[PDB]
Design a binder for this molecule. Structure first.
Ligand SMILES: CC1CCN(c2cc(-c3ccc(C(F)(F)F)cc3)nc(N)n2)CC1
Ligand SMILES: CC1CCN(c2cc(-c3ccc(C(F)(F)F)cc3)nc(N)n2)CC1
Ligand SMILES: CC1CCN(c2cc(-c3ccc(C(F)(F)F)cc3)nc(N)n2)CC1
Ligand SMILES: CC1CCN(c2cc(-c3ccc(C(F)(F)F)cc3)nc(N)n2)CC1
Ligand SMILES: CC1CCN(c2cc(-c3ccc(C(F)(F)F)cc3)nc(N)n2)CC1
Ligand SMILES: *[C@@H]1O[C@H](CO)[C@@H](O)[C@H](O)[C@H]1NC(C)=O
Ligand SMILES: *[C@@H]1O[C@H](CO)[C@@H](O)[C@H](O)[C@H]1NC(C)=O
Ligand SMILES: *[C@@H]1O[C@H](CO)[C@@H](O)[C@H](O)[C@H]1NC(C)=O
Ligand SMILES: *[C@@H]1O[C@H](CO)[C@@H](O)[C@H](O)[C@H]1NC(C)=O
Lengths: 208, 205, 213, 209, 211
């Protein structure tokens, strides 16, 4: 409960509990079900766009959530949440398939763990992508698709699902017309199991 | 006295909880935040991006860290890896902060902790009017990333806006003002506090 | 067992087992033979091509597999596979001889270990290479050759065996792929008496949007 | 003594002793007198200068020495010195106030520790600075001043004191050095009551004809 | 020879090496300096600037030395193993006229031989301040790289040129440049800073742009 959120000893104790129970390297599967991972992108900026090379430089708030019930505690008279370094926690091994640079994480690498076992990690990230830039200077604009999925965990182990101008910079050379998100389950010739992904389509165009 | 310093550092490391907000008994950690500009380096009026260097003055209190200094040092420098530090982020930065200075804080015997790095960073802010007399006005917002208003409060602190500013920049500081906000986002039920730092500057004619 | 894949305690236990057994700095040689390392590149993208300096910037999916049977376990009623951080495992010390930048690994550094002892690591990597770019703007295209082999382990310790398509190749690349061929070599250099194996990957590619009459 | 410098077990024993005594995070203050740190810069190169932005990219040899007598040992029959990773040692928290990039350390991060307790750390560094570039094409040259001081230790705790000019300077630089002068400041800022010492290095340089 | 692929033997040799290795102590033997051999074979010349006298090169840095305390009996065990360099002492070498950090392109493993010889041979990309003048002339330019121990003087570490193979044996046929020749020489030099001499190896290569 909220009147206890600032009891420091309580938070320290919860962090200790979390660190004893957490298995940073094991998927927190429950009920012989895949871990349900939620993923949405809220765009913060569009910095560089190249219509010749089909490359973009974007900043986005990647909202990522899932649950590990082994981490839950009774919060009747203790903090409902604490911030935890992600190195103490399991995080889904998500990758953006068409990213062409490493993600540059702009924000402190702390997640929130909620007393019901929900884990929230929502970093702001700048990253470069290979996507369809054609039309960026037209009224229809461009539609750049970013596919994000678990790299090493197939659909039996991890499912992914969705969790834009509210946080989009008014100062960008560009403007968002629409962001849509859909989910796919796809199998490659490499592997017999399917890998789920969230595909985020960013329709945008140069201002004016 | 070195041994006295070694002992204070030991005490600090015994008591310090680097991953726990130091809020006690019941009040959100009061964090003081102030920017003193050092330099303005790259200004792109087309892409609306700036590249700046600022002294980020950050102070707060952890009274569990306090000690009686009647016959021992008043302060020691401590590596920030040994201390809790607020998880501040500049929302409109478009690059990671480049910390130019040694990552050491001062801990004072009354529990005050001061961290004040010099930081070069790239921002997305209004650069329109930089070449005019009124100047541009670049707004930088800084607040706690994962801690809302019940856990951390963020506040302004104040001399001359150009005291530490480089005479060799192509730019000059007309005015710096800092304002506090508390904003709830559609994502979450709690408010997060921030300092909006308004830097009014123009090219030197 | 496929049903038992999501038994969490089971996964945790296999991981513990693997870490007890794994020797991350020791080649997993079995029956007095070299570790057979399989290597295959699937190109994902060609980003920058400089016809003058003969350089390319490519993203490729480097599929590496090998066997360490000491890692095997009975999966009759347990997960068939688990993901393991590469820092917990031996990984072949592969190097691209003509690369001119460090490999930029774009994906999480986890391998899959299979209950029969097969270990799979398949990172996506962006890297720059010194290669023949000549002809990239013609029908026949350019052919850029990339060599990958073990850096410190010779043929008695590690063997590399290699195993179009544009299945994973971006349709948004300025370039398109005509053919990919992969040859195995065992070469002896004057520095050293023992040979080193490599796979030589021949990427035949050309610009889309070439001048056409 | 020098005749025992290469006794390996002796060196390993000295290293062990140093690591037992060393407090990497505690200033080695003696008799409560501020640790005296010498700082000298010998310029290696000037790589790129920008008259419009007043920025300079330089490479310099940053000669830093101080003492920690707790590290001393009797070298009558053992090595007079050994090299030690700086991570095992206290190093002064020096910062260059007008640097606009992180210092790029070109050399192995080892210090020398002498048996009298002297510690020497002299890295080669490439760094960008904001400084007066004007006059670079004249004969009077330009004068770019670099200030270096302890970041968190004021004058009661650390004092800095400046320790030919082109001896290590690259003959292949587009530029040449007319003069280097090194002076000591002790400055109080509005932020804080205590003074912070610095060494101000004035580099007078110009483009070659 | 027959015993190289005995994995338990290899693990035991690694254990032995790690037990006796002193990664931070020079492996001096019988009160004499560690003899470090260093040689560069060039892989590539990437970017050249005649105005600024800067050069971007890839080279194979062949570095060898001896640590006899690591030696073992290889009669019925492997003759060599690979070892992460973090487990071993490696000479603190620096390129004096390097103007950027060395970008190591290869895995950071050395070989240790049963007779105690250690071989580390990274492929490195690095940028240098050197004489670029004459690069597009038939005579070419001559860029000189000096490499020596940074903190160990001549009583502790000697550096020696190695050994010939063709100068272009590993050089990219696709570079815009071609190597005319490479020479190496040892120097031993005293600086105003220090009483002792520091040894270095000076690599001079005359290279030119293809025409
Ligand atoms: C561009 C951003 C958009 C979101 N926004 C936020 C979000 C957050 C936030 C809240 C919760 C999390 C959680 F840890 F739960 F994942 C992360 C960030 N914090 C702050 N101070 N500002 C303002 C600037
Ligand atoms: C570049 C494309 C992206 C989609 N696709 C894959 C491959 C894989 C993948 C990665 C690694 C393995 C491993 F090595 F661990 F077995 C298996 C599948 N995972 C996902 N989510 N997508 C094929 C390559
Ligand atoms: C540009 C390179 C130079 C030689 N060459 C080598 C050298 C080496 C090699 C041999 C021995 C070592 C040692 F560990 F001993 F130092 C390192 C690399 N390994 C491979 N696979 N290829 C291929 C092309
Ligand atoms: C650009 C440099 C200037 C001095 N010089 C040096 C200095 C040093 C040196 C001496 C002592 C230290 C010490 F550890 F004491 F600090 C550091 C470097 N070593 C070598 N090999 N060369 C040659 C070229
Ligand atoms: C950038 C300007 C010029 C240098 N100057 C300072 C500030 C500081 C300083 C003082 C106190 C702290 C503290 F630890 F308290 F946070 C940090 C830096 N130190 C030095 N040597 N010079 C004022 C800021
Ligand atoms: C601190 O210690 C000193 C001497 O030990 C004593 O004067 C003092 O009362 C203590 N602190 C206070 C004033 O509370
Ligand atoms: C592996 O162990 C299981 C135990 O359930 C048992 O079936 C058998 O001993 C092994 N598997 C096979 C081949 O039956
Ligand atoms: C140092 O050691 C020498 C050699 O035994 C000895 O003669 C001398 O007394 C020692 N010096 C001191 C004061 O420790
Ligand atoms: C090493 O091998 C034999 C083992 O039969 C051992 O007894 C002896 O010490 C060594 N002999 C040599 C030098 O090969």
């Amino acid at each position: 409960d909220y009147k206890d959120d600032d009891d420091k000893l309580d938070r320290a104790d919860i962090l200790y509990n979390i660190r004893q129970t957490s298995r940073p390297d094991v998927i927190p599967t429950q009920r012989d079900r895949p871990v349900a991972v939620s993923v949405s992108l809220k765009f913060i900026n569009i910095l560089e766009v190249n219509e010749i090379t089909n490359e973009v430089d974007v900043v986005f708030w990647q909202q990522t959530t899932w649950s590990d019930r082994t981490l839950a505690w009774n919060s009747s008279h203790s903090p409902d949440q604490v911030s935890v370094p992600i190195s103490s926690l399991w995080v889904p091994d998500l990758a953006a398939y068409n990213a062409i640079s490493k993600p540059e994480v702009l924000t402190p690498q702390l997640a929130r763990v909620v007393s019901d076992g929900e884990v929230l990690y929502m970093p702001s990230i700048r990253q470069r992508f290979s996507c369809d830039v054609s039309g960026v200077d037209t009224e229809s604009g461009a539609t750049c698709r970013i596919k994000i999925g678990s790299w090493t965990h197939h659909s039996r182990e991890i499912s992914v699902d969705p969790t834009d101008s509210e946080y989009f910079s008014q100062y960008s050379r560009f403007e968002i017309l629409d962001v849509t998100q859909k989910k796919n389950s796809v199998t490659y010739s490499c592997c017999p199991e399917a890998y789920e992904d969230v595909e985020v389509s960013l329709n945008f165009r140069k201002k004016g």
